[PDB]
Amino acid sequence: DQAGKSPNAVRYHGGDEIILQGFHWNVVREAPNDWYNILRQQAATIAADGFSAIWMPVPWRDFSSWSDGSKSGGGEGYFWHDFNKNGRYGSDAQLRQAASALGGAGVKVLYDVVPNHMNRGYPDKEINLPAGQGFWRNDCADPGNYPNDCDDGDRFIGGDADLNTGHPQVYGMFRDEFTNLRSQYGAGGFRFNFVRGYAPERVNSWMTDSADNSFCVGELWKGPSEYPNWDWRNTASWQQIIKDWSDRAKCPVFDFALKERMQNGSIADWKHGLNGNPDPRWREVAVTFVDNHDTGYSPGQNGGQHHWALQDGLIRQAYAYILTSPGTPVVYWDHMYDWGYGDFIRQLIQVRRAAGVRADSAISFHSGYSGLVATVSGSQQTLVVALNSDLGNPGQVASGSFSEAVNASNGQVRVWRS
Numbered sequence: 001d002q003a004g005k006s007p008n009a010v011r012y013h014g015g016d017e018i019i020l021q022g023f024h025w026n027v028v029r030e031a032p033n034d035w036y037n038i039l040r041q042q043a044a045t046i047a048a049d050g051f052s053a054i055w056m057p058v059p060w061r062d063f064s065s066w067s068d069g070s071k072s073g074g075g076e077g078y079f080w081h082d083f084n085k086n087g088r089y090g091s092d093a094q095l096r097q098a099a100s101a102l103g104g105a106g107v108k109v110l111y112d113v114v115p116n117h118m119n120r121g122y123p124d125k126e127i128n129l130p131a132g133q134g135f136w137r138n139d140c141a142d143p144g145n146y147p148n149d150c151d152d153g154d155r156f157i158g159g160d161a162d163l164n165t166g167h168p169q170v171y172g173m174f175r176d177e178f179t180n181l182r183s184q185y186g187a188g189g190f191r192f193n194f195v196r197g198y199a200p201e202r203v204n205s206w207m208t209d210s211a212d213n214s215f216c217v218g219e220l221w222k223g224p225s226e227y228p229n230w231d232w233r234n235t236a237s238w239q240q241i242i243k244d245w246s247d248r249a250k251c252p253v254f255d256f257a258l259k260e261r262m263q264n265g266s267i268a269d270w271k272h273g274l275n276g277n278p279d280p281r282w283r284e285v286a287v288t289f290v291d292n293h294d295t296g297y298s299p300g301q302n303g304g305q306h307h308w309a310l311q312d313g314l315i316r317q318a319y320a321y322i323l324t325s326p327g328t329p330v331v332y333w334d335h336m337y338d339w340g341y342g343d344f345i346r347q348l349i350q351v352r353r354a355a356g357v358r359a360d361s362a363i364s365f366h367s368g369y370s371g372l373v374a375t376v377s378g379s380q381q382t383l384v385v386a387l388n389s390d391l392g393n394p395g396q397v398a399s400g401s402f403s404e405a406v407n408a409s410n411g412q413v414r415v416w417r418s
């Protein structure tokens with residue numbers, strides 16, 4: 001496991017990670033207080049499957065609850081009240097055991113952290129920040145969903161639970177928790193939630209202070225149309241928006257550019273995500289995914305959130321693409337362990353590793369065939385990927401001797417190695 005910073009000092013940890021998203025939306029409902037036991041028991045399996053890191057749920061206890069019609073939720077971690085680890089996923093003791101098992105098996109543990117807001121109204125919590133001291137966004141005049149003097153980012157819905165992450169004392173509080181997670185809970189890095197809610201630069205500061213050499217990823221989900229009309233971003237590509245955040249936070253960013261193309265474009269257009277960018281400084285910072293707990297379905301209740309879910313007919317194609325291309329891929333718990341795509345994903349992980357494909361590997365797209373046809377220059381081997389294509393043989397598009405590595409869904413998914 002190579003472990004440096006990119007040529008632009010972005011914390012991609014060598015550019016060779018393969019991450020497993022360690023949970024789905026309904027875990028606290030389906031395996032109440034048992035999740036960490038489940039991960040401890042699966043640790044060896046996860047490690048054997050080929051994952052170098054696991055994205056853990058928010059460790060901070062969440063006893064929130066909400067409901068609007070048919071839809072209900074809470075306790076998943078995004079509306080935590082204090083840093084106590086005895087939450088709905090399991091106890092502090094179980095977390096430590098879980099993190100120890102994962103780490104023991106060579107899997108780095110990445111924690112999901114929510115610095116933007118907290119469950120302000122929770123009657124029994126260990127963290128109580130009073131009003132009138134500048135700890136909250138609403139300690140200042142709050143016009144709309146725009147930075148105010150108490151919060152240099154967007155607000156979460158109403159903004160009444162938004163923290164002034166820039167307040168010396170709030171910053172310091174998060175800083176200390178990140179260091180704790182690293183020193184007693186075996187953190188190898190963090191997944192930053194709702195990155196639109198506070199300054200990119202603050203993420204860099206936090207990383208510098210607590211885990212400079214760790215892996216980090218930011219969740220920036222905000223389209224061009226969400227920026228003000230006078231902002232350059234209102235007319236920029238999804239790629240430029242996430243790339244800009246990454247340059248400032250010095251952390252890799254979720255490829256929402258690729259996700260938007262998977263949802264709205266044709267398969268041939270998948271070449272427009274950040275990870276397909278001809279400049280390695282651009283594609284190496286992309287953190288690719290097919291679905292997550294927000295965008296995809298989850299076993300259980302209401303099918304989870306499914307805010308921007310990939311149709312089942314493209315799941316295999318979607319995984320074939322992210323596992324064989326540049327950037328850093330993320331595999332969704334469910335596709336891997338619930339829905340039966342596990343064997344298929346296992347195969348591709350092996351292909352990725354044997355070819356020596358990494359964050360900055362070169363990718364070329366071929367224009368003369370239907371579907372998506374790409375040539376990937378791994379450090380060990382060259383890959384020819386043809387998805388929903390009429391391509392006849394790898395030799396039509398690449399020089400060399402190729403063997404078939406993957407052939408699934410009636411040739412809709414084909415991968416060849418040199």
Ligand SMILES: OC[C@H]1O[C@H](O[C@H]2[C@H](O)[C@@H](O)[C@@H](O[C@H]3[C@H](O)[C@@H](O)[C@@H](O[C@H]4[C@H](O)[C@@H](O)[C@@H](O)O[C@@H]4CO)O[C@@H]3CO)O[C@@H]2CO)[C@H](O)[C@@H](O)[C@@H]1O
Nearest residue numbers: 064065066074078079156157158159160161193194221294
């Ligand atoms: O006190 C502040 C606000 O509190 C109340 O908000 C409720 C929401 O109405 C609920 O829908 C819910 O919010 C969830 C949200 O549904 C869920 O997607 C998740 O959101 C994450 C998401 O994973 C991710 O995309 C990311 O970008 O950030 C989001 C925020 O972390 O988690 C949310 C929190 O559980 O629950 C909240 C709070 O209970 C109230 O209705 C508001 O008016 C009020 O302003």
Ligand SMILES: [Ca+2]
Nearest residue numbers: 001002013014
């Ligand atoms: Ca690494």
Ligand SMILES: [Ca+2]
Nearest residue numbers: 151153154197
């Ligand atoms: Ca905010």
